[PDB]
Amino acid sequence: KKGVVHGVATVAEKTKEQVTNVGGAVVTGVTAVAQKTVEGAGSIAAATGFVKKDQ
Amino acid sequence: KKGVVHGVATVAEKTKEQVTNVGGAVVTGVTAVAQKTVEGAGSIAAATGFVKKDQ
Amino acid sequence: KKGVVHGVATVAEKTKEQVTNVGGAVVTGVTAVAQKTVEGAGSIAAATGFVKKDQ
Amino acid sequence: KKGVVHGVATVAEKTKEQVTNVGGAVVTGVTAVAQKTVEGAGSIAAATGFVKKDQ
Amino acid sequence: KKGVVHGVATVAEKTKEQVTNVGGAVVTGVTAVAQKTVEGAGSIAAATGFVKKDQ
Amino acid sequence: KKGVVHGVATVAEKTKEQVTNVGGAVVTGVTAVAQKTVEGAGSIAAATGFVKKDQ
Amino acid sequence: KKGVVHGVATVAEKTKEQVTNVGGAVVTGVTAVAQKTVEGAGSIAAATGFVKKDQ
Amino acid sequence: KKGVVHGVATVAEKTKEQVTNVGGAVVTGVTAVAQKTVEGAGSIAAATGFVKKDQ
Amino acid sequence: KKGVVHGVATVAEKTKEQVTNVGGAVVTGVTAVAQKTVEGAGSIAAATGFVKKDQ
Amino acid sequence: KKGVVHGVATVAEKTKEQVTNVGGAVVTGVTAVAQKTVEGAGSIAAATGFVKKDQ
């Protein structure tokens, strides 16, 4: 076989899960957050996949 | 076989999971956060995958 | 076979898990955080994969 | 076979797990944090994979 | 076979686990932290893979 | 002060939370269940407070 | 002071939390369950407070 | 002071938490379960407080 | 002071935590279980407080 | 002072923690279990407080 990509690719066979991202956010997984009190200014309480590039 | 990529690629066969990211965040995995009190200014309480590049 | 990459690639066969990242965050694994009280200003309480490049 | 990379590559066969990172954070492994009280200003309580390059 | 890399590569065959990092953090291993009280300003309580290059 | 109870009592002052139960079930706390597939005959998947006295 | 109980009592002062149970179940605490697949016949997957007295 | 109990009592002053149980189950504490696959017939996967008296 | 109990009592002053149990299960503490695969028939995977009196 | 008990009592003053049990299970302490694969029929993987009296 032959393949040429510029990116971003994701090429496969017999594949149970696939995610391609440029951005941005993708949530595909099981996630449970239980929480009782959030205070403070300002605290990232429960972050799973996170990116902060403030300018 | 033959392959030429510029990146970012992810090329495979018979593959159960795949993630390609440029960014950005991707959450595909099981995650449980149980939490009772968050205070303080400002404290990253529970971070799993995290990136902070403030300017 | 033949392959030429610029990066970042991830090339394989018969492969159960794959992650490619430029960024950024990717969470694909099982993670359990149980927590009772977070205080202080400001304390990284429970960080699993973490990157802080403040300028 | 033949291969030329610029990096960062990860090239393989018959491979159970793969991670490629430039960044950034990737969490793919089992992780359990149980915690009862976090105080102080500011103390990295429980860090698994961590990078701090404040300027 | 023939291979020329610029780095950082990781080239292999028949390989159970692979990690390539430039950064940054990668957590792929089993990790259990149980903890009861963290105080002080500021004490790295339980660090597994850690890098601090504050300027 | 003086108090005589037969039970079940719960007597207090300055008290943030109170539960009295004879039965029966009482749910007053924060609870998050995230779930993707339940099979089998018959499996208690995620039980928090549970009592089974089949005769 | 004077007190006579038959049980079950719970007598106090200045008390943040109180639970009295005869039964039965009481859930007052923070709880997070994240789960991806449950199979088998029949397996108690994730039990927190549990009592099984089948006859 | 004077006190006579038959049981089960729980008598106190200045007390942050109290639980009285006859039964039965009481869950008042922080609890996080993250889980990816449960199989087998039949396996107690993750049990925190547990009692099995089958007859 | 004077006290006569039949049991089970728990009598105190200035006391941060109290548990009285006859049964039965009580979970009041911080608990984190992270888990990736449970198999076998039948294996107690992760048990914290456990009692099995099958007849 | 004077005290007469039948048992099981737990009598005290100025006491930070108290547990009384007849049973049964009580979990009040910090506990972290991280786990990747459990197999076999049937193996107690990670047991903290455990009692097995099968008949």
Ligand SMILES: Cc1ccc2c(c1)sc(-c1ccc(N(C)C)cc1)[n+]2C
């Ligand atoms: C500000 C900012 C942030 C990210 C960023 C850029 C600018 S430009 C860029 C990029 C995306 C894709 C590619 N190829 C497919 C070769 C090369 C570079 N990124 C990832």
Ligand SMILES: Cc1ccc2c(c1)sc(-c1ccc(N(C)C)cc1)[n+]2C
């Ligand atoms: C501000 C901003 C943020 C992201 C960003 C850009 C600008 S421009 C860009 C990009 C998208 C796709 C591609 N290819 C398909 C080669 C190359 C670069 N990104 C991902």
Ligand SMILES: Cc1ccc2c(c1)sc(-c1ccc(N(C)C)cc1)[n+]2C
């Ligand atoms: C500000 C910023 C941050 C990140 C960043 C850039 C600029 S530009 C860049 C990059 C992305 C992809 C590639 N190749 C596919 C060769 C080469 C470089 N990154 C990762």
Ligand SMILES: Cc1ccc2c(c1)sc(-c1ccc(N(C)C)cc1)[n+]2C
């Ligand atoms: C949104 C937001 C706001 C503030 C903020 C963050 C996110 S994250 C962070 C911080 C992280 C680590 C540290 N040390 C390891 C000393 C100190 C401060 N702050 C201060």
Ligand SMILES: Cc1ccc2c(c1)sc(-c1ccc(N(C)C)cc1)[n+]2C
């Ligand atoms: C779209 C597409 C399809 C296939 C494909 C690509 C892109 S890129 C690639 C490849 C790249 C490098 C290598 N080696 C360095 C051995 C081997 C294969 N394939 C096989």
Ligand SMILES: Cc1ccc2c(c1)sc(-c1ccc(N(C)C)cc1)[n+]2C
């Ligand atoms: C500010 C900043 C931070 C990171 C950074 C850059 C700039 S530029 C860069 C880079 C990305 C990909 C490649 N190749 C694929 C050869 C070479 C360099 N990184 C990783």
Ligand SMILES: Cc1ccc2c(c1)sc(-c1ccc(N(C)C)cc1)[n+]2C
């Ligand atoms: C089948 C069954 C189950 C529970 C059960 C009974 C019968 S009878 C009983 C009981 C309740 C309250 C009291 N007092 C206030 C002294 C004494 C006993 N329980 C708790």
Ligand SMILES: Cc1ccc2c(c1)sc(-c1ccc(N(C)C)cc1)[n+]2C
């Ligand atoms: C089948 C069954 C199960 C539990 C059970 C009984 C019967 S009877 C009983 C009981 C309840 C309260 C008291 N006092 C207040 C002295 C004494 C005994 N329990 C706890």
Ligand SMILES: Cc1ccc2c(c1)sc(-c1ccc(N(C)C)cc1)[n+]2C
């Ligand atoms: C079948 C079964 C199981 C438990 C059980 C009984 C019967 S009867 C009993 C009991 C409860 C409370 C008291 N006092 C307050 C003196 C004495 C005994 N338990 C704990």
Ligand SMILES: Cc1ccc2c(c1)sc(-c1ccc(N(C)C)cc1)[n+]2C
């Ligand atoms: C609801 C339910 C059904 C079956 C069941 C349980 C719960 S719990 C259990 C069991 C527990 C331990 C053991 N060994 C330590 C050998 C063997 C079997 N089974 C078989």
Ligand SMILES: Cc1ccc2c(c1)sc(-c1ccc(N(C)C)cc1)[n+]2C
């Ligand atoms: C309803 C009620 C109110 C008060 C009360 C009881 C019941 S029971 C009790 C007590 C029992 C035993 C003891 N000692 C063995 C020293 C001391 C005090 N008080 C003080």
Ligand SMILES: Cc1ccc2c(c1)sc(-c1ccc(N(C)C)cc1)[n+]2C
């Ligand atoms: C089958 C079974 C199992 C446990 C069990 C009994 C029967 S009877 C009993 C008991 C409970 C409380 C007391 N006192 C307060 C003196 C004395 C005995 N237990 C603990």
